[PDB]
């Protein structure tokens, strides 16, 4: 009821044994009443590592998108080693979403690595179960066995109706996903552990399908973008391997489903100044001259009768002399061109002082030999060239034309394919102009270039006019155990890709949310634009180039920091060599670096002085020692992970305050949220995701099931908790309900339609479904629905949530009125009460933990010791936690060696892995998540609690209690002890 206190553990240890004499009764009672639950005490185990690989094929759908819906690919298995290193080999194949699917090596939620199907963003199959939301559901297939060698899996995806189907060895899989969120792009993915060998088959050039695709399903290889070539790559990574060594890599840039749609500017309604009959005709004539010259250069000629094989121009007259349609074609050509120019900031004109007469119009080498020759060339480029802004303007004109073209192509119903197929309405060039290759970019620009030069010669006066913030930065720092408070130290940073990198010395208490140098916690240098940041910005030094090494030295004797670029010391504007001076030592300094989107770098601390470059040039004889030189093992580094998680609200938070009021008359214990700086300057308003620190767990079996009636109170199972919205706070900006442990969405524009949801349906052989289970991670109701029923109303809004742990359903009421919204869940599920609110008043919300007639309070559900106590109470363990976007994580010392290489045009792309890699995981029972045990090196409270837990284990096992030792052997096994014996970190 109070929390994790080591003093209680010490009390139990003193209970066990005193003065060298063991009390067997106390030891047995403690072992019986503490160990079997496997809750409230941290757990330890050994797990394997899981890595995922994708084929770099992104497919999705949107309104007016240029992509295709149905897709299908093949995966074959060559070698599988069952039970490698005491654990079953992991191998799953499926689809993953671009946004939200960012697995990391180690840690994770659910007693091990996630892989495919352990989150609501990925869907997978492993030969016996369907995996989604970290939940496995058995499925019936003619061949029911785990993924074996020489087994082939066919994976298809339909976007018109959300449904992912699998087919093993031709035999269909009776289970299918449905009704999943369509935001983002889907890509194939395979997750695996050490000891596997698989091969992707996308058809066409790369691989051959073992079984024919279902009708209407296109091969995956047809979805490759023209700008890129096929290549196997991991999903996401914060490091890579190179000849220099481990290259730290920043966040990557990914496309979106809305990027493929064309969004041009309509110009048909645009009116034009009186320039049509004045200069539009002249522009048309110039276009005719250039186009006829192009024909004359080739074998095309002008015969009286139009013919293609005979090379005969239809008009066959020097002057175009076209009839109404043919002439109006070029008339509308130039009209649309002028309309596009006027739609943008460019303003057309003809102020040239009769420069048309001054034009040459005589470049006739007599190469023409027929009627439609003598096409004058104005030599407009020779007179005046095109400015860079003019060339850019040509570029956006071509882009606008291509975009409107793609718009009609989508309107008729065309789609994109890597292979051209006219009967199939598939065109490999209808992607947006940015996504087009340079060949078609040049092909759709020459005529516009000529027209724009004509405009220049004619005197045209046209003149050209939160959540993502965390995802665009990545910080790597040395571990807090390597802080230096004396001496002179040096390290190096190589910038492989120039731009958006910031290297320097930070402090142990540096936060991951804030940028480097924004706060006083870091002294950093930015070489992309050549400045130094301690608190603010100030120019210093020169920008770097690709392959440049910057050496950072710090001396705490002189309290200075010096940055050198390629062996030369950078100096400020005044000429001072030291970038910073008069720096208090404080608690020490650590090496730190920050990388932006699509950036790579090499952080060389200098374990081996031979590999350290430019050290002898500057630093060796100046008395500086390389950082981390004499240590035997490489430095463990911690990186800034952008996975949102719920953390307790700090008591010193400047903006939000939590009050704990209880025991009042006619009011149950409650927790009230208040805004400290509302209605004042320097106040920030944003979405706030709050939850309770303790969950309520449903029963294993769903076997049905004035003053309060005691018999019903003892026989009831329902529970109640309410949320009060104070007057002045808009009910339209509150969502009240429950959240599963796996909720990691920090959307600033949260809506009830943005929640995850997926229905898994099991069918029979004939296709008659018999089970359809819905899975999500957020069960809430919106206050907008209640207020709409009916300015600021003095009456508060009370929303009460009722749950039934036996039946398995939850209902919602507002102001004592039953609401139509209800939810149903599955057994063995734990939900935390939660509210998502946008503050708009000084008083925001109040969690009330009370009770109703014949309904029991949440305290009994949360705490076992008070299961039969109807009196509401708020023990100190119950607390309000808020979502936090960014956190710190520990980089693993070793990583899997995944080898990817195309086997052949008929074999596909082969992926293999054989080197085992295991880790020790510490699991929190209530939160249902685990982290690496080495992460306790910085978590000094969990470390102390676990040490006292081990002491308690020794105490209960002390003095020849062999039965208790046998019982303990199940909790801590031989393998864990042997692994921990040789654990050097």
């Amino acid at each position, epitope marked *: 009821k109070h929390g994790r206190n080591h003093k209680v553990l010490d009390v139990l240890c003193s209970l066990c044994v005193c003065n060298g004499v063991a009390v067997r009764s106390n030891q047995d009672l403690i072992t019986e009443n503490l160990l079997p639950g496997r809750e409230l005490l941290l757990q330890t185990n050994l797990i394997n590592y899981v890595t995922s690989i994708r084929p770099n094929i992104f497919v999705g759908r949107a309104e007016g998108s240029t992509q295709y819906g149905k897709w299908y690919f093949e995966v074959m298995v060559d070698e599988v080693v069952p039970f490698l290193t005491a654990q079953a080999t992991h191998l799953r194949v499926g689809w993953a979403l671009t946004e939200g699917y960012s697995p990391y090596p180690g840690g994770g939620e659910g007693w091990g690595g996630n892989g495919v199907g352990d989150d609501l963003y990925s869907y997978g199959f492993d030969g016996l179960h369907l995996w989604t939301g970290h939940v496995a559901r058995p499925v019936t297939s003619p061949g029911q066995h785990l993924l074996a060698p020489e087994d082939v899996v066919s994976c298809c995806l339909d976007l018109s109706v959300p449904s992912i189907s699998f087919r093993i060895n031709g035999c269909p899989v009776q289970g299918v996903f449905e009704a999943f969120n369509l935001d983002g792009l889907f890509f194939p993915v395979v997750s695996f552990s050490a000891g596997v060998k698989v091969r992707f088959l996308l058809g066409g050039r790369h691989g051959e399908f073992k079984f024919l695709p279902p009708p209407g399903y296109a091969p995956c290889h047809e979805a490759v973008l023209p700008r890129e070539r096929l290549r196997l790559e991991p999903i996401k990574e914060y490091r890579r391997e190179g000849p220099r060594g481990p290259h730290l890599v920043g966040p990557s840039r990914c496309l979106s489903h809305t990027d493929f749609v064309p969004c041009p500017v309509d110009t048909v309604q645009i009116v034009l100044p009186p320039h049509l009959e004045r200069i539009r005709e002249k522009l048309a004539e110039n*276009i*005719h001259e*250039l*186009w006829a010259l192009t024909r004359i250069e080739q074998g095309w000629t002008y015969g009286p009768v*139009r*013919d*293609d*094989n005979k090379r005969l*121009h*239809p*008009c066959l007259v020097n002057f175009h002399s076209l*009839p*109404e*349609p*043919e002439r109006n*074609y*070029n008339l509308q*050509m130039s009209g649309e061109t002028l309309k596009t120019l006027l739609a943008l900031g460019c303003h057309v004109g003809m102020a040239d002082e009769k420069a048309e007469d001054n034009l040459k119009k005589t470049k006739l080498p007599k190469t023409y030999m027929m009627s439609n020759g003598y096409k004058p060339a104005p030599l407009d480029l020779s007179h005046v060239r095109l400015t860079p802004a003019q060339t850019t303007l040509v570029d956006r004109l071509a882009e606008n*034309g*291509h975009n409107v*073209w793609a718009r*009609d192509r989508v*309107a*008729q119903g065309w789609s994109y394919s890597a292979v051209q197929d*006219i*009967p199939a309405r598939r*065109n490999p*060039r209808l992607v947006p102009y940015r996504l087009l290759d340079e060949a*078609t970019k040049r*092909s*759709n620009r*020459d*005529s516009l270039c000529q027209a724009v030069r004509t405009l220049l010669g004619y005197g045209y006066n046209i003149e050209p006019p939160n959540q993502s913030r965390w995802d665009r930065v990545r910080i790597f720092r040395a571990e807090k155990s390597y802080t230096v408070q004396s001496g002179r130290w040096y390290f190096e940073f190589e910038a492989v890709t120039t731009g958006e990198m910031r290297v320097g010395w930070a402090r142990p208490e540096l936060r991951p949310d804030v940028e480097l140098g924004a706060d006083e916690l870091a002294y950093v240098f930015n070489g992309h634009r050549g400045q130094r940041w301690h608190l603010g910005s100030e120019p210093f030094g020169r920008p770097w180039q690709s392959g440049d090494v910057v050496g950072c030295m710090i001396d705490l004797t002189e309290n200075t920091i010096i940055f050198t670029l390629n062996g030369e010391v950078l100096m400020s504007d005044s000429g001072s060599e030291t970038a910073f001076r008069e720096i208090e030592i404080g608690d020490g300094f650590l090496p730190v670096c920050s990388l932006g989107p699509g950036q790579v770098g090499h952080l060389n601390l200098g374990q081996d002085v031979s590999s350290l470059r430019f050290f002898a040039i500057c630093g060796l004889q100046e008395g500086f020692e390389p950082f981390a030189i004499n240590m035997q093992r490489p430095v463990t580094t911690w990186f800034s992970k952008s996975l949102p998680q719920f953390e307790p609200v700090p008591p010193e938070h400047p903006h939000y305050e939590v009050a704990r009021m209880d025991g009042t008359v006619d009011t149950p214990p409650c927790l009230r949220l208040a805004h400290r700086t509302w209605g004042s300057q320097n106040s920030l308003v944003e979405m706030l995701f709050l939850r309770l620190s303790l969950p309520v767990q449903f029963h294993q079996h769903f076997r049905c099931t004035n003053r309060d009636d005691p018999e019903i109170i003892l026989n009831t199972t329902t529970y109640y908790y309410s949320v009060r919205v104070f007057a002045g706070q808009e009910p339209s900006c509150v969502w009240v309900g429950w959240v599963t442990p796996d909720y990691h969405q920090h959307d600033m524009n949260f809506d009830l339609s943005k929640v995850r949801a997926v229905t898994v349906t099991m069918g029979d052989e004939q296709g008659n479904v018999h089970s359809s289970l819905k899975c999500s991670n957020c069960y809430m109701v919106w206050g907008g629905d209640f207020v709409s029923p009916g300015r600021i109303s003095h009456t508060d809004l009370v929303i009460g949530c009722l749950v039934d742990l036996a039946t398995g359903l939850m209902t919602f009421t507002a102001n004592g009125k039953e609401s139509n919204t209800f939810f149903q869940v599955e057994p063995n599920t734990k939900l935390f009460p939660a509210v998502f609110v946008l503050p708009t008043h000084q008083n925001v919300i109040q969690f009330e933990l009370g009770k109703q007639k014949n309904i029991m309070p949440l305290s009994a559900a949360m705490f076992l010791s008070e299961r039969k106590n109807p009196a509401p109470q708020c023990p100190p363990r119950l607390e309000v936690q808020m979502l936090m976007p960014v956190s710190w994580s520990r980089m693993p010392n070793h990583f899997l060696q995944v080898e990817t290489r195309r086997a052949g045009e008929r074999l596909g792309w082969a992926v293999q892995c054989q080197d085992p890699l295991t880790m020790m995981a510490l699991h929190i029972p209530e939160e249902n998540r685990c982290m690496d045990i080495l992460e306790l090196s910085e978590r000094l409270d969990l470390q102390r609690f676990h040490s006292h837990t081990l002491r308690l284990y020794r105490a209960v096992c002390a003095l020849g209690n062999n039965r208790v030792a046998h019982a303990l052997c199940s909790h801590v096994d031989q393998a864990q002890l042997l692994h921990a014996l040789e654990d050097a970190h």
Partner: nanobody
Amino acid sequence: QVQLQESGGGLMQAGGSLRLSCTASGSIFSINSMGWYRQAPGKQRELVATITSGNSINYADSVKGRFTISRDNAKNTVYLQMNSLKPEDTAVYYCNADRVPNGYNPWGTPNDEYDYWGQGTQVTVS
């Protein structure tokens, strides 16, 4: 959107007369060059005589026989007549409208690929 509904060209013996009606329903702008294509079963797609606004007709190899193609811009109606027949003439005919006039286009690929196909109909010769 410009939709070209093409109906006619029923099964007839050699020498029979076939009438095909093509109607292009859509925006009146860029209505021109209501050309014709034909794809033989499992063979290449050839170009039938293309008629454009202004009474301009362009012939090719596939126009062999008695081909009379006439178009009306008032209602965007093309009345193709094939008085003779040959066994090789069996193909799926399509009526296609393209903004490109008389097969000439000084604009470039963006307007060359600006094309509006049609459903078409199957013409069979015994």
